[PDB]
RNA sequence: GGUAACGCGACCGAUCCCGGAGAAGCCGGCGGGAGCCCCGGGGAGAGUUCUCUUUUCUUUGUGAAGGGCAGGGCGCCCUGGAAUGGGUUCGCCCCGAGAGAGGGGCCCGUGCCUUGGAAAGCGUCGCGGUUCCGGCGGCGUCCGGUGAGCUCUCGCUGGCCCUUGAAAAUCCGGGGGAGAGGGUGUAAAUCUCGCGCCGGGCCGUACCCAUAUCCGCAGCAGGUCUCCAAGGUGAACAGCCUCUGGCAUGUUGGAACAAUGUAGGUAAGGGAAGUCGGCAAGCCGGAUCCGUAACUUCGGGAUAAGGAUUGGCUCUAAGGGCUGGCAGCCGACUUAGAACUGGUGCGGACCAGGGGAAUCCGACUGUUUAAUUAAAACAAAGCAUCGCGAAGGCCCGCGGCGGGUGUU
RNA sequence: GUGAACAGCAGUUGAACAUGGGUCAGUCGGUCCUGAGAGAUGGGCGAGCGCCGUUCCGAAGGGACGGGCGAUGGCCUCCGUU
């Protein structure tokens, strides 16, 4: 399960053409977006949380959206 | 083979296959567990055949 | 106290047969099985002793996994033979061809007089 | 402290094996085990490995000496005697 | 011990032992070639020794396996033929080399890859010349001298492992472990220890022989035991 | 790219040649890292409460594959030249062929953090559809500390050998430089860099593995190869008791308690007077402290022989680490001595040598008549004769440029 | 489910009897390589089925990057294919 440590290269990671949902989980101190492709889980930890909508918003065309519960 | 069988359940019943498991029994014959695809069911088509 | 089991049919502790343990999220001990202890190269030369430093040590199966230089350090005669062996032989034969075209000229005062 | 009065390595075998060969165990299990100044390099480690099959553990160069000792006795003037009709011919 | 069970126990053992062919240049001139490793073999209570001779027609590197001269070491050079220098672990012709010098792993035919002298503590020494004819004599180990033939080559020295039969071998096993590798050959039972249909010689009451145990030259098998065609018998004195 | 050991994402190219790996014995000593056992505190549920007991038990978690750091090891490179010899291990062992001091570099990193991963798992507390839930909700799933303890691993170092402890499929790294790619363009050959798409057929896979599924004519006290292994007393995988998991005493019940048997004990006084013969039984036994003869191949004899000490509880004395000849705090064992004390009782069961003075036989360890002989027989190291220089000795074979000793 | 027979007394029980289900894999084995050893052909022995021998009395390699002639396929452009 692959990480990514910036928020300017997961979007591209979700925009590519085998990239096929994202799931976003919220558990208290951090949340946690990932998105699956064709071999790996790329994760991403978003520890603020107004810096959780924003995004929430900004993710890409037609995908199929969750959030984890 | 299950090459073989994989395209006799495909060109008869017509439905598209994932897997074809097999094992033989202690009475001697083949015995074929066949998966199939999400858009197929198969309660439905094992109507059409005359298993249920 | 969990005593425990193999999970393959092979039970007697031969050699391709190596285990180790593990906790599981279940809270559960179970065995997991090992791999080889890979050497680290020797050197060409014979008479050094012991190992390399550059090129990762790993069973052989395994070095078309990996990529050039992971199996070598650059250097004429790189990750075949040792650093130390290496530096006496551009010597050696630097000096050794050297004392050759010297013979050449102390022969041939023989031959000019006689 | 001294621990026996005539027994050298062998010690290492008691009462065993009767008197007049535990004496002649006692010349070729001393000097077959001892260590050897290496000519070449010149340090104290000259060593056997196997039946006459010996071995410096710092310059890594390796002799066939005697099964027993370093020098085989009269393989110590074979060399002064193959030197010696070296003389004769040469003139 | 004529098969099956008996045969010689070969698979730890390290090399045949030889010299080299002969061709053009042992023939007409000289090569050289250098040491690369002395080296232990079983069955033979003796040291080998691998040298890197290079091959004159292809790029290549021959390696052979000659009976290790004692005074040898590594890295050493060994350089040979018909001209080569007589000193130590340096081969050449019995017709070249001077009376006085010691050999070993020396020939009996002119190319045969050498027959006499190998074993531990050997030598094989040259007396006398007669270069018509091109033959020579050769005092070998049981105090004999063979006429040679003249081109018929030898190692110089005298061979390595010295001095074996020094030591009392003490306890059984070390015996066993000599003989467990070499062939089925020990702990041997006498021929009196054998009933009437196991061994000619035992037998009875006592544990006696009863025949004389010299035997003619001209026994058939079964028989021919003890000592055959024996020249004289008793404790050795005077000579 | 770096003085350099060597580092960075790729980083072109044939026949040939060189080496690496697959590829190794057994035994001792020491250290690193997991499992397991222990010890003080926190949660949840139990058990016990006549009296006491902040108590006794149960239970308290993170796969592979990837990144990051600890932890371990170097026969790796630089400045630099050391007797008033130095460095250092339990043991060793190291050095003008370059030590101490300083600074770097490479391989393993099965441990801790990270994404996985809490959304599942385990513990408890409470509510639905009587059914037909991988139902739904809540709290919790902590923090500290020790070690010659046991099990697996990983390294470093020493001992032994007339014993030197497998083969090859498969896969990499080099020297060499045959060649190839296109004229500053859109560039070309070319990549052992990252992403992506298509695919892996055949046969075996249940269960017993044994005082019940195998062999012994049977559900036969016989026999038949391994893996994991908790508490208590101990030197201890010994003997005895107990947790987890297991069992119904091994093809029968009930009543009596006679003579013979089979396997256990005990015996007043004498003590081999019994018998072919001390056969059987019994006596001695653990550890601490003293003390020990003949004879000897000097190594043994030797636990010789012969004595004394040993419970319970109340004390004293020595033996360590860490923070900044002294202060503070952190701590797991042992070892010596003194006193009080019981009906002279303490290796309290369990474990656990009878001793001495000689004659012969065989040097010792080792093998041997499975199913009436384990011995003084066999083998053994040591000694001595005998044949043999290969067209050869010894030997196999009905035969052949036959085979064994022999890769001598 | 049955209670006959068998399971050395008994049976509701059973490993008996009678009917009906149950063994799914690229990643866990065999296959694939050699070990002590087994054994064809060339040769030779043999009345004969056959035996001896395994590198020894053998013309034992049926493959490749390129040099060149002339023939395919997709616009014989470029390369597998002879």
């Known amino acids: 399960p692959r990480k990514i440590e910036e928020i300017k290269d997961f979007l591209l990671t979700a925009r590519r053409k085998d990239a096929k949902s994202v799931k976003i989980k919220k558990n208290k101190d951090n949340v946690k977006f990932k998105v699956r492709c064709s071999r790996y889980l790329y994760t991403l930890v978003i520890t603020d949380k107004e810096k959780a909508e924003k995004l929430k918003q900004s993710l890409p065309p037609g995908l199929a959206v969750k959030e984890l519960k | 083979n299950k090459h073989q069988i994989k395209q006799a359940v495909k060109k008869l019943y017509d439905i598209d296959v994932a897997k074809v498991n097999t094992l033989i029994r202690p009475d001697g014959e083949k015995k074929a567990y066949v998966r199939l695809a999400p858009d197929y069911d198969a309660l439905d088509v094992a109507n059409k055949i005359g298993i249920i | 106290v969990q005593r425990l089991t193999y999970r393959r049919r092979l039970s007697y502790n031969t050699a391709s047969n190596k285990t180790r343990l593990s906790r599981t999220p279940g809270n559960r001990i179970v065995y997991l099985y090992t791999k080889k202890v890979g050497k680290a190269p020797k050197s060409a030369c014979g008479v050094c002793p012991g190992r390399l430093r550059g090129v990762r040590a790993v069973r052989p199966k395994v ?29 050696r034969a630097f000096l050794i061809e050297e004392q050759k075209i010297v013979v050449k000229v102390l022969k041939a005062q023989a031959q000019s007089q006689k | 402290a001294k621990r026996t009065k005539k027994v050298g390595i062998v010690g290492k075998y008691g009462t065993r094996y009767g008197a007049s060969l535990r004496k002649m165990v006692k010349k070729i299990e ?17 060593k056997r490995r196997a039946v006459g099959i010996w071995h410096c553990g710092s310059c890594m160069k390796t002799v066939a000496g005697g099964a027993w ?11 002064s005697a193959i030197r010696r009709l070296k003389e004769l011919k040469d003139q | 011990g004529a098969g099956s069970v008996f045969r010689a126990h070969v698979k730890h053992r390290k090399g045949a032992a030889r010299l080299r062919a002969v061709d053009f240049a042992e023939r007409h001139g000289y090569i050289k070639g250098i040491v690369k490793d002395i080296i232990h073999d079983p069955g033979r209570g003796a040291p080998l020794a691998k040298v890197v001779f290079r091959d004159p027609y292809r790029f290549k590197k021959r390696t052979e396996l000659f009976i290790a001269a004692e005074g040898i070491h590594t890295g050493q050079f060994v350089y040979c033929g018909k001209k080569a220098q007589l000193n130590i672990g340096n081969v050449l012709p019995v017709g070249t080399m001077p009376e006085g010098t010691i050999v070993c792993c020396l020939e009996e035919k002119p190319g045969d890859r050498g027959k006499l002298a ?48 020094d030591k009392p071998i003490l306890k059984a096993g070390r015996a066993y472990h000599k003989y467990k590798a070499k062939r089925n050959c020990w702990p041997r039972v006498r021929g009196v220890a054998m009933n009437p249909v196991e061994h000619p010689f035992g037998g009875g009451n006592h544990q006696h022989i009863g025949k004389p145990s010299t035997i003619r030259r001209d026994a058939p098998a079964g028989r021919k035991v003890g000592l055959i065609a024996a020249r004289r018998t008793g404790r050795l004195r005077g000579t």
């Not at chain 4, 000792?69 to 060399?79: D, E, G, I």
């Not at chain 5, 033959?135 to 074996?164: C, D, E, Q």
């Open chain 3, 63 to 91: 070095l078309m996994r990996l990529s050039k230089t992971k199996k070598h350090v650059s250097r004429a005669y790189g990750g075949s033979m040792c650093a130390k062996c290496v530096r006496d032989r551009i010597k």
């Open chain 4, 30 to 46: 001393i000097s077959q085990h001892a260590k050897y100044t290496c000519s070449f390099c010149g340090k104290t480690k000259m």
């Open chain 4, 69 to 79: 000792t370093y020098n085989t006795t009269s393989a110590v003037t074979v060399k």
């Open chain 5, 118 to 165: 190998r074993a531990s503590g050997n030598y094989a020494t040259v007396i006398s010349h007669n270069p018509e004819t091109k033959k020579t004599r050769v005092k070998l180990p049981s105090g004999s001298k063979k006429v040679i033939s003249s081109a018929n080559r030898a190692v110089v020295g005298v061979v390595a492992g010295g001095g074996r039969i």
